[PDB]
Each structure stands twice: as structure tokens, then as C-alpha cells.
């Protein structure tokens, strides 16, 4: 459960090596981590600090839309994320239009590129034993950088006994701010796809290459480490939904969430 | 150390779910595993059965060559792997000529495609902090299958304090026959690149999506589980080598390897 995340933070505090990110900002870093969160009658929204579940849910729905318009997200009461609001081919555009040439935020990308997300759902329905059920996302800043740049993250899905699991592998993870939010966002993506395909959620596994903590996050994380996890909440899906594009924020209700207080981490 | 591999095998024997591979052959399978092998003054050639180190070394040198000729490997006294011996764009061709159109085993691919392997080495020398140091390989059978198919495996390299680590992520791993051999092959690739770039080897991390054991391997693996690991050997590199293409089998010597006997596993 959440003790894995806390054990990992503790491990980086104890053994991480000082290393600077591309902007020069100090971090402590280790290489190679993995944790596994059960999705079975529970939902891994971490409880040692209040995670911004509304941001998680609204940003994932916005990825699913394939939107490249920052306005379409901020107006939902959420901050998180050459004209105004145009973000270029961000993660959601790649999920729905993989390989299409990006032009405009208000363009019509209908039937352009590979719809990786629909493909994952179609493969689970046509062959749930397939072990190539994988979707990938690139940091847009890498795309013009070199030929055939590598991906930044990949999700592999897996089905056994009518249960759907997901392993997210990211090449670099911010353990303080980004990981608890991503645990929740990919766990929620797994619940959505399992709902669509008639499966029950199984496990979300999160695997990192470089796992780092920003120097300015160390003192808050030391304090978060003294807090006792509470039992995870549940996620209910409130109606039958048939197509991944048809979900709305109102379809979801988190139950029994009882976190310790919000922790601010400098962005 | 090797107790991780043994604990993983035991875990699959105890909790793996029966699942058939694409040929129908029974396996036991779990999803999401990871292990970490130190490369620091030791080399993880497993000792609870004799691993075919000559096959490991000769096949890796053959990948590095970018060869698509089965003859060029078998003639080395090694079996492991529309004319005779032409294997098509196998893993090594992808490592050295990523994205080039494949024609013939005796063609001249000079300067065609991305040399992912050289790129990894060039990136370690120009920016060892980069966390995009990643090379990827596809099962050739997937290439004509669909547009933009997913990769079968990826290696991410990492440098801290003059030490080079590698994390291999494979979407599916055969725990009985393929994993001990791959631990050795990617560990050896990490020693070669660390030699070339003037770094010391750090850790090899091996992460799996679907991790499975073939039904016909269960009885031998139960017996391998009763065997006590011995201390790992060392790998010596016998001369100064400057370019990854310049290594030869004679440059390497395994020292202090003292395995339990060979275990045959049905292919």
C-alpha cells in the first residue's frame, strides 16, 4: 500500500545522490524503483497528504479528449498545466493522434494518427491475452530534438481472470509532487478502461527509471513521513458508460477519503 | 543478489495464474516484477544453474555487429537463435540501423537508420546527466502487423558519480530460460559501455511486465530452488578498448565462476 511510497521516499532521503535537473535545481536521485497498488475494492489516492483529486480527474478527462487547449482545463477550476493556451502536441494529443503532424489547437484531427487509447481498448476486447497492449507518450520538447527520440512514459496493460492491470514505466519521476498525482491518474485510467471493457481493476504498478526528490521538498517530505497512512478510499463509477470519450467528471465519486492535511511543495 | 530471482520464481509457482502463450503452451504468469543486481566488483552470472556464458558473450557481440546472419553466430559454437540464415531485422540490426528499411542479409546498411547504440554512448559522453539515454528493440514479427507497433524491450542508462547503471524493461519475460541469460547479456552490455565511456558499472535493474514460467519448466525450477547460491564471479576486461565495435570474445574473462550443474529446460 502507501507504505511503499513512504519507504521509497525514505530510501531516497537516506541514499539519494545529489544531482541537478536540466534547469540546475538540486535534487536527490536514485535509479530503478517499483511499487504495486491494489485496485481491488479500493483506490490508491494517497492519505498521508490530501492529493488534488479534482485536478487528477479533470486533467485525465482532458487528456482523453485529446485537447491541446490549456483554457479547456483551467476553466474547470484546475491549474496544473504561437498563440495563447496552445500547448502543442501534449500527452493527450499523442494518446489519440499518435504520429499526426501538429498544426493548430483548433484544427480538426479527425481520423489522423493512431488512436493508441482506442487501440488499447480494442485489443483488450479482441485478445485480452495479448502482451503487446501498450500506449506511449513523449515529452513534446524532445520531438524536434533528434530523429526517433525516446518516449518519456509507457503504460502496459494486462488481463488475467477478467481483471485489468496497468504498469506505468516513466524514465524520470518527481517523487514529491508528480508520483502521488500519477498514481491516482493511472489508477483512474485503469478503472475507466476496465469499466469500458467489462473487467474488474486488478493492480497498478508504477516503475521509475530516475526517481528524484527536489531539495526544497525534503523538509516537507520528512514531515509527511511521520504521518500514519489511513485506509484507502473507494472509487465508484455512477452509471454504465460504454465509450471512453463518454465519461464525465460527474460519473465518479470517491468514498471514504480521509487524508492528512495538504502539503505545499514549491513548483 | 540471486535470491531475488529465486524469490520471484517461488512467487510465480505459488501465485501465478495459468495462461497460455500465443502458441497455446501452458504457463504460469504474474504481472510486474523488478530486481536489482550489483555490477560493482562482481558480475551477475547466476550460480544456481550453469548459465551458457559463451552463448551470452557471442550472441551480444553478434547483436553489436548488427548482423542478420544466423550463420555468423552458429559458427561460433553457439545455437541460441527468403534465403538460408537470413533472420530479417533482428534486435541487433535495430540497435545499429533503427528505422532503415530491411532488404538483404548481405546488403550495405552503412549510415542508414539511427545507430541507437552509438547514440547512447555519445550521449553518456556529452551529457551523462541526461535521463533520455534509452535504446529500444521490437519483435520483428510485430513490424508489419500494425502502424507504430509497440516495442518489446527498452534499456535506459543512468550515470551518477562516474558509475553507469542500466534498467532493462521487457514487456514479457520467460523466467526459466530467458531471464538468467538476459541478466547476464545486459549486465555485460553495461560493462562494455562503461568501459568505452570510462565509467565504472553500477547496477543492472531488470523490470518485467508479464513474467511467466512454462509448465514443463516447473519441476526443474522446483529443484533449482533447493540449491544455495554461491558468490557471484567477476568479469575482467583484458585490454583497453576504445570503440564498442572493437570488442572481441577474447577481451573478456569470467573469474571465480562456480555454478551448480546445468539445468535443461525444454525449448
Amino acid at each position: 500500500g502507501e507504505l511503499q511510497y513512504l519507504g521509497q521516499i525514505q530510501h531516497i532521503l537516506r541514499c539519494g545522490v545529489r544531482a541537478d535537473d536540466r534547469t540546475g535545481t538540486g535534487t536527490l536521485s536514485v535509479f530503478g524503483m517499483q511499487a504495486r497498488y491494489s485496485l481491488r475494492d479500493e483506490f490508491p489516492l494517497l492519505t498521508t497528504k490530501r492529493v488534488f483529486w479534482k485536478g487528477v480527474l479533470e486533467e485525465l478527462l482532458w487528456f482523453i479528449k485529446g485537447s491541446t487547449n490549456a483554457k479547456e482545463l483551467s476553466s474547470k477550476g484546475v491549474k496544473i498545466w504561437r498563440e495563447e493556451g496552445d500547448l502543442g502536441p501534449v500527452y493527450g494529443f499523442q494518446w489519440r493522434h499518435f504520429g499526426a503532424e501538429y498544426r493548430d489547437m483548433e484544427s480538426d484531427y479527425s481520423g489522423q494518427g493512431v488512436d493508441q487509447l482506442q487501440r488499447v481498448i480494442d485489443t483488450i476486447k479482441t485478445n485480452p491475452d495479448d502482451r503487446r497492449i501498450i500506449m506511449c507518450a513523449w515529452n513534446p520538447r524532445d520531438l524536434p530534438l533528434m530523429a526517433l527520440p525516446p518516449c518519456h512514459a509507457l503504460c502496459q496493460f494486462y488481463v488475467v481472470n477478467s481483471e485489468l492491470s496497468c504498469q506505468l514505466y516513466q524514465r524520470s519521476g518527481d517523487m514529491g509532487l508528480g508520483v502521488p498525482f500519477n498514481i491516482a491518474s493511472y489508477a483512474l485510467l485503469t478503472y475507466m478502461i476496465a469499466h469500458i471493457t467489462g473487467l474488474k481493476p486488478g493492480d497498478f504498478i508504477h516503475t521509475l527509471g530516475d526517481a528524484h526528490i527536489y531539495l526544497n521538498h525534503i523538509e516537507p517530505l520528512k514531515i509527511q513521513l511521520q504521518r500514519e497512512p489511513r485506509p484507502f478510499p473507494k472509487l465508484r463509477i455512477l452509471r454504465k458508460v460504454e465509450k471512453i470519450d463518454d465519461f464525465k467528471a460527474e460519473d465518479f465519486q470517491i468514498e471514504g477519503y480521509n487524508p492528512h492535511p495538504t502539503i505545499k511543495m514549491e513548483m | 543478489g540471486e535470491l531475488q530471482y529465486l524469490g520471484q520464481i517461488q512467487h510465480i509457482l505459488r501465485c501465478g495464474v495459468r495462461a497460455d502463450d500465443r502458441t497455446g503452451t501452458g504457463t504460469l504468469s504474474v504481472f510486474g516484477m523488478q530486481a536489482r543486481y550489483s555490477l560493482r566488483d562482481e558480475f551477475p552470472l547466476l550460480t544456481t544453474k550453469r548459465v551458457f556464458w559463451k552463448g551470452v558473450l557471442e550472441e551480444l557481440l553478434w547483436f553489436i555487429k548488427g548482423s542478420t546472419n544466423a550463420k555468423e553466430l552458429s559458427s561460433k559454437g553457439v545455437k541460441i537463435w527468403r534465403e538460408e540464415g537470413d533472420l530479417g531485422p533482428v534486435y541487433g540490426f535495430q540497435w545499429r540501423h533503427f528505422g532503415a528499411e530491411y532488404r538483404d542479409m548481405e546488403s550495405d546498411y552503412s549510415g542508414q537508420g539511427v545507430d541507437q547504440l552509438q547514440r547512447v554512448i555519445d550521449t553518456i559522453k556529452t551529457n551523462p546527466d541526461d535521463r533520455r539515454i534509452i535504446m529500444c528493440a521490437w519483435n520483428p514479427r510485430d513490424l508489419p502487423l500494425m502502424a507504430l507497433p509497440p516495442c518489446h524491450a527498452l534499456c535506459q542508462f543512468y550515470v551518477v558519480n562516474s558509475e553507469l547503471s542500466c534498467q532493462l524493461y521487457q514487456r514479457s519475460g520467460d523466467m526459466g530460460l530467458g531471464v538468467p541469460f538476459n541478466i547476464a547479456s545486459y549486465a555485460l552490455l553495461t560493462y562494455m559501455i562503461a568501459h568505452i565511456t570510462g565509467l565504472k558499472p553500477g547496477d543492472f535493474i531488470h523490470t518485467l511486465g508479464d513474467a511467466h514460467i512454462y509448465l514443463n519448466h516447473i519441476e526443474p525450477l522446483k529443484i533449482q530452488l533447493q540449491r544455495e547460491p554461491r558468490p557471484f564471479p567477476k568479469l575482467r576486461i583484458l585490454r583497453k578498448v576504445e570503440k564498442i565495435d572493437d570488442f572481441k570474445a577474447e577481451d573478456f574473462q569470467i573469474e571465480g565462476y562456480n555454478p551448480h550443474p546445468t539445468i535443461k529446460m525444454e525449448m
Binding site: 502536441p89 499523442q94 499518435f98 504520429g99 506511449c136 513523449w138 520531438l143 530523429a147 526517433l148 527520440p149 525516446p150 518516449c151 | 533503427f98 528505422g99 539511427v114 541507437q116 534509452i134 535504446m135 529500444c136 516495442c151 527498452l154
Partner: peptide
């Protein structure tokens, strides 16, 4: 691995 490669240009999306």
C-alpha cells in the same frame, strides 16, 4: 524510440 521514436519520433512520435
Amino acid at each position: 524510440c521514436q519520433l512520435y
